[PDB]
Amino acid sequence: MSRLKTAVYDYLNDVDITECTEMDLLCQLSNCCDFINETYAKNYDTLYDIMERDILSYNIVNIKNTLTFALRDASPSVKLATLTLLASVIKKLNKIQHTDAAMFSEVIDGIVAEEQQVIGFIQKKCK
């Protein structure tokens, strides 16, 4: 719905950026998550170890609750840490059964809450 929300969905089903501008949200969101992913690989390694059970079993409701709860007080860099996590979780659950971003709408709602701050971090502060 919002420009940020539309971009999260787009990113979550890796739509593939054409036309990148320094202020294209999808591209810059995408760049921020690839940067977080690489720089915190080992951490995502741990995070997978913790969630393997939920992913192998295809336990959507738990995964959703887990992340929503994580998002509660969240600062912009955890919200983006969370979206990066979710991207990779989405991809992994597809091996099992069709999973797309809508299944996680409420998580997205929590990653995009307080827009100005999240965008502020993406453009100004992410790298």
Partner: peptide, 25 residues
Amino acid sequence: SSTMGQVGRQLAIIGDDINRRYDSE
């Protein structure tokens, strides 16, 4: 549970090496 405390722990960590490390001191 403790599974969801963990994830939460781990996400805060990452976002602390971020929004704290390369931000202000």
